[model samples]
Target: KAMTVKFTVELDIERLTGQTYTDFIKNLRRSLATWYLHGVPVLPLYNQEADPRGFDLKLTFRGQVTTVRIHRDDLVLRGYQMQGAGKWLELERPSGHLIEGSELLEFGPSYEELAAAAQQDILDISYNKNALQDAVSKLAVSTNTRDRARSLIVVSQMFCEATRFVDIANHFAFNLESSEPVKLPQWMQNDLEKNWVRFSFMILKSNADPCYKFEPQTIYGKIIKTADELLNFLGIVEQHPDTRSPPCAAG
Candidate 1:
């Protein structure tokens, strides 16, 4: 079996950001591949002139150089450094400025946290229920199988991300008061998991994979259809601290 390093790369279909979805995805993919493989920057490395929003850089932990790259909504880390005279260490993010073994061993997961935050931001974007629905409204009327598969896969990904965001919000209670956790039921959780990005991506990639053909009628489709219900649930879970109003009704 092959080990997989799972990470997400996404597009902004809105085009309001002045960056086209096609170009953004291309830049993200290019920069991500280079840094993840070589610990070196190639295309855009946060240059003031070339890339103001630089996506590649090296972190100096002690004296070692560790490459970091941000791929659209993902951050990837690779390479290593020497810390002490005789100690070579596998990198791990630490807190409060600490370390063990080699020179670069002092790296912190701050970069890691930042990366996850970027991905999370994408989920936040997915909260616009109307926008998501609009994006896929054309899927059902289309007849192109491959294109249909791609669109389904993309929208499925958005659902998975949005769902995960809701899950996280419930985990923290959105800084609200709640004696009980606001997680969804086990059955709902199972339903959402069935449409996880990896699972759907495989289907999208299948030349002979009919998996996507059934998605429009599966739990994935339902999740998209009920996005408003789920998003409103998040609103309730994190609703006004003092509002005694009950959470929105379920779908």
Candidate 2:
């Protein structure tokens, strides 16, 4: 004997970071959760593949209505007795980049777990430290110009900028770990523009140093100068920014 199940169901997407918090921003990621049943699509980030754990979520209700809105134009949602369930049904599942919808759905601690994971992914800065170290090493060996003093200053300034990124990354970790990742505002469009401006000033001061001629004189100087120009052209410098405050002098 086959069974016939039917009904009108409503889905509420809850935000892990509640609206009451009052610090919500559009660019921030926590906004995704409030779209539970709302008809919107999400794209993936960083990882190439989809999120398997995200698909593990349970969804319910089915049966496409070829004909329904016509017969009962006044069909209120409360008319049918809703009962059913469903979940991710695709082998090539979508990337699990959905907005955290905890509060909208009244979700429990499980959402907390998901939020923690998402937070880590969003603000993870451990990689930044490694990346900055690489930049410093690259400069250390570089003989871009003839002056060691300028090269040394350039490297030091670069190091400081890298450290700043490290700080932002660590602070991101702290907020995420505190279960208040929402507190930190989302960054819009490569969040390093302002920092770059200041970095320029630092380099300007370094260039002004009387000890090292700005023109590349030595093999090392040529190498460093080329590297800096290349990095700037490659967009790496823009991606990684530093305050790079002008210093008194080079040692």
Candidate 3:
């Protein structure tokens, strides 16, 4: 009998780290695709030609629409109902990347789980931000131009990291995980479009130290304030101490 079916795929990244998490989804897909091509075709989505959309997959057929919510490590399905049943089916398979059974639903992370992960990310960003602020303070007291430049580079790196967590936290709040064709928030675009990090690094590498030779000290001060504002918005209680110190001798 011809009917309707819905499925979602997720590549959950919250639990894994670094390369283990980075290469996992692609590697698994390659493995699955290879097997599928070699006469073991349980699913067609893994095949190279499929080119599924990012974190969310939407499929429609036979007057039915299906949604697939995925993280690198997990997947879930929605908008699918059995022929006579009113409720959308709930299914999960845990063993390997693929599952074979009567159940066709994969339940992934709960709201609370993603929320908790977002909180943890904020904590990490807060700690690193504080550390960078302290380094900036020490640079203010340093007599060396190189020291000032190096400090600004460190600050820029920390700011980049903070922005990443901020975006990730936003995604968690929105229940969207990173995936193919990932989109960026306007605030994140502001940071990247300005190329502040790259510009800062360029000055750091130049003979003229930006923090010492330019008004960037003031700009960097403003960045510190902005970072604190974001940290507060993320529900992080600890704020970096914007300690004022003597200007560097280079200035």
lDDT of 2 by residue, 1-251 (tens): 11111222221112212221112211221222222111221112222223211211111113211110000111111001111221111111122212221111111122123234224322232222222223234323333222212222222222222222333333333332232222223231134322343333333333333343333222212343532332231111211111122334455
* lDDT, candidate 1, 5-108, per-residue tens: 23434443332222232243334335443222122122223222222121332222223332222222222222122223322222244222122233333232
- The residue ranges of model 1 lying beyond 4 angstroms of the native Cα positions read 1-25, 30-75, 79-200, 210-251
Q: The CA-based lDDT of model 2 is what?
A: 0.23
Instruction: Return the lDDT, model 1, position 106.
Output: 29
Stretches off by above 4 angstroms in model 3 are: 1-163, 177-182, 192-247
What is the Cα-based TM-score of model 1? Answer: 0.23
Best by TM-score: 1
Off by over 4 Å in 2: 1-164, 185-193, 204-251
Clashing pairs in 1: 46-54, 82-103, 83-102, 83-103, 84-102, 84-103, 93-108, 93-109
TM-score of 2: 0.18
Q: After superposition, how far is residue 180 of candidate 2 from its true place, in Å?
A: 2.6
